[PDB]
Write an enzyme that holds these catalytic residues in place. Structure first.
Site, PDB file in Angstrom:
ATOM      1  N   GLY C  10      17.773  48.843  49.159  1.00  0.00           N
ATOM      2  CA  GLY C  10      19.139  48.570  49.876  1.00  0.00           C
ATOM      3  C   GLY C  10      19.157  47.126  50.443  1.00  0.00           C
ATOM      4  O   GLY C  10      18.288  46.646  50.545  1.00  0.00           O
ATOM      5  N   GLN C  11      20.438  46.649  50.919  1.00  0.00           N
ATOM      6  CA  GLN C  11      20.546  45.602  51.310  1.00  0.00           C
ATOM      7  C   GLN C  11      19.729  45.090  52.552  1.00  0.00           C
ATOM      8  O   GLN C  11      19.104  44.070  52.627  1.00  0.00           O
ATOM      9  CB  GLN C  11      22.163  45.025  51.832  1.00  0.00           C
ATOM     10  CG  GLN C  11      22.316  43.960  52.586  1.00  0.00           C
ATOM     11  CD  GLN C  11      23.802  43.687  52.746  1.00  0.00           C
ATOM     12  OE1 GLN C  11      24.282  43.573  53.941  1.00  0.00           O
ATOM     13  NE2 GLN C  11      24.693  43.551  51.683  1.00  0.00           N
ATOM     14  N   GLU C  71      23.129  47.583  43.415  1.00  0.00           N
ATOM     15  CA  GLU C  71      24.136  46.492  43.262  1.00  0.00           C
ATOM     16  C   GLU C  71      23.560  45.082  43.110  1.00  0.00           C
ATOM     17  O   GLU C  71      22.601  44.949  44.071  1.00  0.00           O
ATOM     18  CB  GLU C  71      25.312  46.503  44.280  1.00  0.00           C
ATOM     19  CG  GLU C  71      26.225  45.586  44.571  1.00  0.00           C
ATOM     20  CD  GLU C  71      25.731  44.733  45.856  1.00  0.00           C
ATOM     21  OE1 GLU C  71      26.477  44.770  46.817  1.00  0.00           O
ATOM     22  OE2 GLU C  71      25.093  43.777  45.715  1.00  0.00           O
ATOM     23  N   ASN C 228      17.015  39.212  61.030  1.00  0.00           N
ATOM     24  CA  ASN C 228      15.985  39.668  60.006  1.00  0.00           C
ATOM     25  C   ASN C 228      14.864  38.686  60.367  1.00  0.00           C
ATOM     26  O   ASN C 228      13.786  39.346  60.197  1.00  0.00           O
ATOM     27  CB  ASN C 228      16.297  39.102  58.653  1.00  0.00           C
ATOM     28  CG  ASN C 228      17.532  40.351  58.368  1.00  0.00           C
ATOM     29  OD1 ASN C 228      17.572  41.530  58.890  1.00  0.00           O
ATOM     30  ND2 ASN C 228      18.251  40.160  57.384  1.00  0.00           N
ATOM     31  N   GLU C 254      -5.331  54.460  59.552  1.00  0.00           N
ATOM     32  CA  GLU C 254      -5.453  54.369  61.228  1.00  0.00           C
ATOM     33  C   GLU C 254      -4.200  54.215  61.713  1.00  0.00           C
ATOM     34  O   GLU C 254      -4.017  54.374  63.198  1.00  0.00           O
ATOM     35  CB  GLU C 254      -6.196  52.919  61.151  1.00  0.00           C
ATOM     36  CG  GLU C 254      -7.926  52.942  61.068  1.00  0.00           C
ATOM     37  CD  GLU C 254      -8.336  51.836  62.052  1.00  0.00           C
ATOM     38  OE1 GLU C 254      -8.949  50.888  61.164  1.00  0.00           O
ATOM     39  OE2 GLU C 254      -8.168  51.383  63.201  1.00  0.00           O
TER      40      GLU C 254
HETATM   41  N1  LIG Z   1      19.224  44.251  60.427  1.00  0.00           N
HETATM   42  C1  LIG Z   1      19.840  44.348  59.298  1.00  0.00           C
HETATM   43  N2  LIG Z   1      20.608  45.385  59.220  1.00  0.00           N
HETATM   44  C2  LIG Z   1      21.397  45.587  58.132  1.00  0.00           C
HETATM   45  C3  LIG Z   1      21.224  44.395  57.069  1.00  0.00           C
HETATM   46  N3  LIG Z   1      22.170  44.592  56.069  1.00  0.00           N
HETATM   47  C4  LIG Z   1      22.662  45.809  56.503  1.00  0.00           C
HETATM   48  N4  LIG Z   1      22.167  46.122  57.498  1.00  0.00           N
HETATM   49  C5  LIG Z   1      22.603  47.426  58.357  1.00  0.00           C
HETATM   50  O1  LIG Z   1      22.489  48.638  57.629  1.00  0.00           O
HETATM   51  C6  LIG Z   1      23.629  49.295  57.541  1.00  0.00           C
HETATM   52  C7  LIG Z   1      24.180  49.096  56.221  1.00  0.00           C
HETATM   53  O2  LIG Z   1      23.453  49.573  55.133  1.00  0.00           O
HETATM   54  P1  LIG Z   1      22.997  48.502  53.773  1.00  0.00           P
HETATM   55  O3  LIG Z   1      21.561  48.387  53.977  1.00  0.00           O
HETATM   56  O4  LIG Z   1      23.899  47.316  53.867  1.00  0.00           O
HETATM   57  O5  LIG Z   1      23.554  49.438  52.604  1.00  0.00           O
HETATM   58  P2  LIG Z   1      22.834  49.767  51.285  1.00  0.00           P
HETATM   59  O6  LIG Z   1      21.555  50.419  51.627  1.00  0.00           O
HETATM   60  O7  LIG Z   1      22.955  48.515  50.529  1.00  0.00           O
HETATM   61  O8  LIG Z   1      23.556  51.075  50.483  1.00  0.00           O
HETATM   62  P3  LIG Z   1      24.969  50.732  49.819  1.00  0.00           P
HETATM   63  O9  LIG Z   1      25.465  49.498  49.764  1.00  0.00           O
HETATM   64  O10 LIG Z   1      25.643  51.965  50.318  1.00  0.00           O
HETATM   65  O11 LIG Z   1      24.656  51.301  48.525  1.00  0.00           O
HETATM   66  C8  LIG Z   1      24.504  48.947  58.688  1.00  0.00           C
HETATM   67  O12 LIG Z   1      24.023  49.641  59.781  1.00  0.00           O
HETATM   68  C9  LIG Z   1      23.897  47.538  58.586  1.00  0.00           C
HETATM   69  O13 LIG Z   1      24.250  47.000  59.957  1.00  0.00           O
HETATM   70  C10 LIG Z   1      20.241  43.339  57.349  1.00  0.00           C
HETATM   71  O14 LIG Z   1      20.084  42.493  56.402  1.00  0.00           O
HETATM   72  N5  LIG Z   1      19.837  43.365  58.518  1.00  0.00           N
HETATM   73 MG   LIG Z   2      24.604  47.858  49.329  1.00  0.00          MG
END
Ligand SMILES: Nc1nc2c(ncn2[C@@H]2O[C@H](COP(=O)(O)OP(=O)(O)OP(=O)(O)O)[C@@H](O)[C@H]2O)c(=O)[nH]1
Ligand SMILES: [Mg+2]
Ligand SMILES: CCCCCCN(C(=O)[C@@H](NC(=O)[C@H]1CCCCN1C)[C@@H](C)CC)[C@H](C[C@@H](OC(C)=O)c1nc(C(=O)N[C@@H](Cc2ccc(F)cc2)C[C@H](C)C(=O)O)cs1)C(C)C
Ligand SMILES: Nc1ncnc2c1ncn2[C@@H]1O[C@H](COP(=O)(O)OP(=O)(O)CP(=O)(O)O)[C@@H](O)[C@H]1O
Ligand SMILES: Nc1nc2c(ncn2[C@@H]2O[C@H](COP(=O)(O)OP(=O)(O)O)[C@@H](O)[C@H]2O)c(=O)[nH]1
Ligand SMILES: [Ca+2]
Ligand SMILES: [Mg+2]
EC number: 3.6.5.-
Lengths: 54, 334, 437, 428
Positions: C10-11, C71, C228, C254
């Site tokens: 995921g992102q 994506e 991050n 561990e």
């Molecule tokens: N700390 C942090 N949180 C993130 C980041 N990107 C997204 N989030 C958090 O993760 C959640 C959103 O999920 P994402 O990881 O963007 O979604 P994804 O896994 O890409 O899933 P889809 O887009 O639904 O296919 C929210 O709580 C966001 O604030 C990041 O780069 N850093």
């Molecule tokens: Mg996404």
């Protein structure tokens, strides 16, 4: 109180300190959960297309 | 415009606070499950402290200290006084108490109890009241929950005319900065029917609750002597004052108790803030030595004092944090 | 030497991954080229850093990493960014349309069509490992891919690598930077399904990191880059013992042994100090006592909660910089008399301590200041169950009205998986309270 | 490449649709010939959402212009941006629909619909990964309401797993005197409840009142109404067209905005409200944008937000401003007005910020609310409808095209059910 397990090297050191003592599903089952989801999803779509054909 | 929620509807004390907050016209009451509040007047039991202080753009404040139960439960207080080095076994102002589980320190209790038999000294204990151990242990086993065996004070201070027992209730407010505020008005909750040494059956002269006294209301209105009259009695009958004979010891006990738990319950560097009103119950013996009986986490007030006390809770506990558009408390300094 | 494969889903997983691998490269003196001048064994090795990096004959040091997203947008920024020649194109896996903040869509609908391809690419990294120990899985709880696909991947990894450890770095949802209102649903779903398959999981509440960035780095409105780069420091402190010479937490087993005595209660609380703004001039360097005392402040924790009202069952201190055992034990002695630190009765009150003499590396021109000593405390405390209560409450408010449930039922999930997931979390909250009081 | 196919049907649909394309083309620096002449890569990053890229370096709107008469589309062709559209994507008949939903849906519209679907198919095949469709139309006329809904139904049959999005203009007696518009609108709403995922309720009642009361235009034209529609359409599509974190595609927007599938009718808002040519020399503060965008006088549906509760909200800010100040102000709105946001959907307001503003404004804010107060709009249509239908007035215009009273009763039922469904969640 008590130090133990002291190990040292050139990068650093590590130890433990004590203050007080005490007192998975198969490949098959995964596929049947995924395929059933797909069948429920395909049943929803076929029912939609039935309604639209009417 | 500040906002609050009410989650204990039985609270006589915090009903008057909500009514007074609404009367200011700068506070609005929300429905109980709306999370977007500045102030939670919280529930008695199972209070969701873990949900507080996670609402962006809202400073959140609650009327309980998480962990204050350790002072306010009978079995917890005994354990707290025994195990905390700042109070300790050597604590001179708490009666000799023991935690007793039904079928623990029953073995340690019986050792000290049977020493008093050999010593030829007053050996009465409270759960309820009796001098023989066999009655007390058998009373707990067939009852239900855990109980406390505490030393009963044979020699209480007695009021005249009438030869009556009493306890003192002091109300203490601990704000978000951990200032300890003793309300200047306390109250003596008196006995009406005279104190008998032999007769332990009649649990009316021995137990001085406002409810259990139901002759009644002869000497004063509703078995409630306030501090002006009690001070006058001390000046006339004993040639001393309330401040000097009793109140210093109360001040000491209150501060000692609350300082001991400050590390465990303070909200100083926390994501939500706490205050709480406590009710300390004090017994006074014939030597004018003060004794702690219990601490109540959700006390009621005496009928005359509600107006003043609750306005004080607003001024120092709430409007200190949430400011708006002659001090009834004494600050106990530490 | 025993290899560790990192997986970024995921992102959030992907973007946190980049922060982590950038930082690892700086820590080890590896360049964007992939070249590592200081490494003298060319074409291979069994050094501690080789746990995270394989080697080519041309001297390129290449992460044991797969990035998977449904994506292309964010993984395209990895493909075209500063560290692009670091990764082999088979490590970067992308779909076409994402999971739309829907667990069900990530797990069932797109999970079924992408899972075999991801296990294939993971298998290509396992094949070139002499002694693979396990997996570090980075993902959000709130995204559909992060929640839905991750939970499926974890189930499969249990089948295909049953003996191997699996660690998580999971991002817990926070309204200040959340992108969806159903993140509570997604968090509960993926936690229920992943629980049996995770040996140790490090939860980072975005609320905590956001506030740390405001309060201590004086950033007005933190972006994901700000978040991050802080997360990467905490992750690096935690993985340092795998990548560097030492005798504490040197293999994935561990982490479980030292931090997780109960299998279900596998969510250690992380606390980091010091966090100091770079643009702050004249900074008084904090002592060992001061940074170690800061590990018991809620404001420095990755999850806001109160360890005082709870019980510890394990506690590690991981120091980086100018620190000796003398000053650590002195700091602990002071701290024990001043603070509420109850362990459960069946564990010893005690601390496992690891020190690496190299201070924390900072990303140049970043937000974090260079410091002489830093510490990450890993404490398994029951106070972290507060995070589950909050999440479970938001779930209950929505689920009582069946709000948004149709989106999940529309992808083939049964309505009963919600309440199964929920009562598993009820049991977890009960497990924590039973241990803690 | 996450492509949207645009369709515009009828006079209203083609007029607001043409204005949408003028406005967004200008924001993306595409000129009337399709050439890019902008000064930022943010304009081109997600250009493929709405434009095909042809040879040269030309951009052609993924747009299909539909009508049963030639007038409005000759007007669009003759207009300034008319040359931008693909000539094969003009699909038009000669008969007209006579402001009759039955003619658009069943008789006149049935004859033209297959040739529209061919153009839609060709546009859809050309997409790397189609996300769905957006339609512009009125519910009060014949073609847009009747044929527009037929098209929605047909598109759903071919593309059942894609999102369907409409910009649906609701009729008001302040703008139109055609007596049968409540009939057409009720029939169309019946269709929209079943066959769309997201519908923006653009209410002519509100558009007129804004123009008359707030903009002090005592004789508003359709142009004055449409100016407000084009700004709203720019605003609500910003997150689809520019790089962004929140509601970046139609499906994610739907998952954030629609807690129950039927309750997908949105109440849009915009600040500042402007009239054409009258210049906003003063830029708004973040506090003013936030007050105005939530204000009843800035809503494009004639509904009192205080008479309902918000289920979900998307607020979208544009221009260069403090993100900190946006957050503070958005948190301030929902904390001060707490009782209007349902407690059973936590954190139901989501905020986006895009650096690039619209033309002529430094600062702007666009609101999208799923409020239970939208029932007032349907209740108004329902009352007008029932008043005629209880005496079967003007019904021969519909039965003469082959319809039965039963359809009217069914449509009336489904819309009345929708209303009570909003009331159910308003009192929860
Ligand atoms: N700390 C942090 N949180 C993130 C980041 N990107 C997204 N989030 C958090 O993760 C959640 C959103 O999920 P994402 O990881 O963007 O979604 P994804 O896994 O890409 O899933 P889809 O887009 O639904 O296919 C929210 O709580 C966001 O604030 C990041 O780069 N850093
Ligand atoms: Mg996404
Ligand atoms: C011939 C059937 C048209 C019905 C027009 C409705 N409107 C009226 O003012 C009309 N009034 C009514 O209908 C009243 C009278 C009875 C009681 C209540 N009704 C509503 C007058 C024109 C009647 C004499 C206006 C719209 C009308 O405004 C005028 C003329 O003042 C029109 N605007 C336009 C218009 O906007 N033209 C555009 C181009 C255009 C745009 C949209 C189209 F659909 C067609 C053409 C070009 C102009 C220069 C512009 O941009 O402002 C064309 S007709 C409504 C907003 C209330
Ligand atoms: N050790 C002791 N010596 C003398 N009297 C005692 C005593 N312990 C209790 N009492 C008497 O019993 C009364 C009530 O005691 P306590 O306050 O412990 O019970 P309780 O907590 O059930 C009353 P409430 O529930 O209203 O707070 C006191 O007012 C006091 O007079
Ligand atoms: N806001 C707006 N409303 C319009 C426009 N044109 C027509 N309408 C309204 O749309 C309804 C008539 O529908 P129309 O689109 O003209 O009929 P069609 O050509 O059969 O679709 C009436 O309620 C008109 O007031 C326009 O350009 N803007
Ligand atoms: Ca090597
Ligand atoms: Mg017309």
């Amino acid at each position: 109180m008590e130090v133990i397990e002291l190990n040292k090297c050139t990068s650093g050191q590590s130890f433990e300190v004590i203050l007080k003592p005490p007192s998975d599903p198969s490949l098959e089952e995964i596929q049947k959960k995924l395929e059933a989801a797909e069948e429920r999803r395909k049943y929803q779509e076929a029912e939609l297309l039935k309604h639209l054909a009417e | 415009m500040y906002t609050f929620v009410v989650r204990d509807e039985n609270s006589s004390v915090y009903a008057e606070v909500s009514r007074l907050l609404l009367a200011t016209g700068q506070w609005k009451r929300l429905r109980k499950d709306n999370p977007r509040f500045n102030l939670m007047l919280g529930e008695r039991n199972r209070l969701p402290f873990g949900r507080l202080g996670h609402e962006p753009g809202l400073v959140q404040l609650v009327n309980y200290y998480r962990g204050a139960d350790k002072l306010c439960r009978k079995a917890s207080l005994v354990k707290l006084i025994k195990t905390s080095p700042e109070l300790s076994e050597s604590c001179t102002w708490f009666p000799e108490s023991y935690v007793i589980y039904p079928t623990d320190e029953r073995e340690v209790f019986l050792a000290a109890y049977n020493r008093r038999r050999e010593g030829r000294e007053g050996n009465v204990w409270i759960a309820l009241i009796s001098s023989e151990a066999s009655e007390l242990l058998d009373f707990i086993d067939e009852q239900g929950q855990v109980h406390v065996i505490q030393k009963y004070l044979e020699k209480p201070l007695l009021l005249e005319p009438g030869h009556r027992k009493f306890d003192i209730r002091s109300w203490v407010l601990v704000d978000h900065l951990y200032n300890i505020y003793l309300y200047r008005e306390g109250v003596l909750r008196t006995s009406s029917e005279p104190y008998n040494s032999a007769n332990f059956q009649d649990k009316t002269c021995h137990l001085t609750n406002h409810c259990i006294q139901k002759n009644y209301g002869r000497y004063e209105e509703g078995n409630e002597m306030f501090f002006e009259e009690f001070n006058q009695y001390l000046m006339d009958a004993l040639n001393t004052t309330l401040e000097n004979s009793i109140l210093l010891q109360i001040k000491h006990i209150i501060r000692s108790c609350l300082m001991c738990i400050e590390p465990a319950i303070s909200t100083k560097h926390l994501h939500y803030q706490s205050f709480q009103l406590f009710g300390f119950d004090f017994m006074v013996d014939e030597e004018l030595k003060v004794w702690l009986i219990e601490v109540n986490g959700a006390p009621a007030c005496a009928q005359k004092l509600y107006a003043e006390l609750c306005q004080g809770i607003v001024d120092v506990a709430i409007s200190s944090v949430f400011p708006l558009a002659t001090s009834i408390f004494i600050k106990l300094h530490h | 030497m025993r290899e560790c494969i990192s997986i970024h889903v995921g992102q959030a997983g992907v973007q946190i991954g980049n922060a982590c691998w950038e930082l690892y490269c700086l820590e080890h003196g590896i360049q964007p080229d992939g070249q590592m001048p200081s490494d003298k064994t060319i074409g291979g090795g069994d050094d501690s850093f080789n746990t995270f990096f394989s080697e080519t004959g041309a001297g390129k040091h290449v992460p044991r990493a797969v990035f998977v997203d449904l994506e292309p947008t964010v993984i395209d920024e990895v493909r075209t960014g500063t560290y692009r020649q670091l990764f082999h194109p088979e490590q970067l896996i992308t779909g076409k349309e994402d999971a739309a903040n829907n667990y069900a869509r990530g797990h069932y609908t797109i999970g079924k069509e992408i899972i075999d391809l991801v296990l294939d690419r993971i298998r290509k990294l396992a094949d070139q490992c002499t002694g693979l120990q396990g997996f570090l899985v980075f993902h959000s709880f709130g995204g559909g891919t992060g929640s839905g696909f991750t939970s499926l991947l974890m189930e499969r990894l249990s089948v295909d690598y049953g003996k191997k450890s699996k660690l998580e770095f999971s991002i817990y949802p926070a309204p200040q930077v959340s992108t969806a209102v159903v993140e509570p649903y997604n968090s509960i779903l993926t936690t229920h399904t992943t629980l049996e398959h995770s040996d140790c999981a490090f939860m980072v509440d975005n609320e905590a990191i956001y506030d740390i960035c405001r309060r201590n780095l004086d950033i007005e409105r933190p972006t994901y880059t700000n978040l991050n780069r802080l997360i990467s420091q905490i992750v690096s402190s935690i993985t340092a013992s795998l990548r560097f010479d030492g005798a504490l937490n040197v293999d994935l087993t561990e982490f479980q042994t030292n931090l997780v005595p109960y299998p279900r209660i596998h969510f250690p609380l992380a606390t980091y100090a010091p966090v100091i703004s770079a643009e702050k001039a004249y900074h008084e360097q904090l002592s060992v006592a001061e940074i170690t005392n800061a590990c018991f402040e809620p404001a420095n924790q990755m999850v806001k909660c109160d360890p005082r009202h709870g019980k510890y069952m394990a506690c590690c201190l991981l120091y980086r910089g100018d620190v000796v055992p003398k000053d650590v034990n002195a700091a602990i002695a002071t701290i024990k008399t001043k603070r509420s630190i109850q362990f459960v009765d069946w564990c010893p009150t005690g601390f496992k301590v690891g020190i690496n003499y190299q201070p924390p590396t900072v990303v140049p021109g970043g937000d974090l200041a260079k410091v002489q000593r830093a510490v990450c405390m890993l404490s398994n405390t029951t106070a972290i169950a507060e995070a589950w209560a909050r999440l479970d409450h938001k779930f209950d408010l929505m689920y009582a009205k069946r709000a948004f449930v149709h989106w999940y039922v529309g992808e083939g999930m049964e309505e009963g998986e919600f309440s199964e997931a929920r009562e598993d979390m009820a049991a977890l909250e009960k497990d924590y309270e039973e241990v803690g009081v | 490449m996450r492509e949207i196919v645009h369709i515009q049907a009828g006079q209203c649909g083609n007029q607001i649709g043409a204005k949408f394309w003028e406005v967004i083309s200008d924001e993306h620096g595409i000129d009337p010939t399709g050439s890019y002449h902008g000064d930022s890569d943010l304009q081109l990053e997600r250009i493929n959402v709405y434009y095909n890229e042809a040879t040269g370096n030309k951009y052609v709107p993924r747009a299909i212009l539909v009508d049963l008469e030639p007038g409005t589309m000759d007007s669009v062709r003759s207009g300034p941006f008319g040359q931008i559209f693909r000539p094969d994507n003009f699909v038009f008949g000669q008969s007209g629909a006579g402001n009759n939903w039955a003619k658009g849906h069943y008789t006149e519209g049935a004859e033209l619909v297959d040739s529209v679907l061919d153009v839609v198919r060709k546009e859809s095949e050309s997409c790397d990964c189609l996300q769905g469709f957006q339609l512009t139309h009125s519910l009060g006329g014949g073609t847009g309401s009747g044929m527009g809904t037929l098209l929605i139904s047909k598109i759903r049959e071919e593309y059942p797993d894609r999102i369907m999005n409409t910009f649906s203009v609701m009729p008001s007696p302040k703008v139109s005197d055609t007596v049968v518009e409540p009939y057409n609108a009720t029939l169309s709403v019946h269709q929209l409840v079943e066959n769309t995922d997201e519908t923006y309720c653009i209410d002519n009642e509100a558009l007129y009142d804004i123009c008359f009361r707030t903009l002090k235009l005592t004789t508003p034209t359709y142009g004055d109404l449409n100016h407000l529609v084009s700004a709203t359409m720019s605003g609500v599509t910003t997150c689809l067209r520019f790089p962004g974190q929140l509601n970046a595609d139609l499906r994610k927007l739907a998952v954030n905005m629609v807690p129950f599938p039927r309750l997908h009718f949105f109440m849009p808002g915009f600040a500042p409200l402007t009239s054409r040519g009258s210049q906003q020399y003063r830029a708004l503060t973040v506090p003013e944008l936030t007050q105005q965008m939530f204000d009843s006088k800035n809503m494009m549906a004639a509904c009192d937000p205080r008479h309902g509760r918000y289920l979900t909200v998307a607020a979208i800010f544009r221009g260069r401003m403090s993100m900190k100040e946006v957050d503070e102000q958005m948190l301030n709105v929902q904390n001060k007005n707490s009782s209007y946001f349902v407690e059973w959907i936590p954190n139901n307001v989501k905020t986006a910020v895009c650096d690039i503003p619209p033309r002529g404004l430094k600062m702007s804010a666009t609101f999208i609310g799923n409020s239970t107060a939208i029932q007032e709009l349907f209740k108004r249509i329902s009352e007008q409808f029932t008043a005629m239908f209880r005496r079967k007035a003007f019904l021969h215009w519909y039965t003469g095209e082959g319809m039965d009273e039963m359809e009217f009763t069914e449509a009336e039922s489904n819309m009345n059910d929708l209303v009570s469904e909003y009331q159910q969640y308003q009192d929860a």
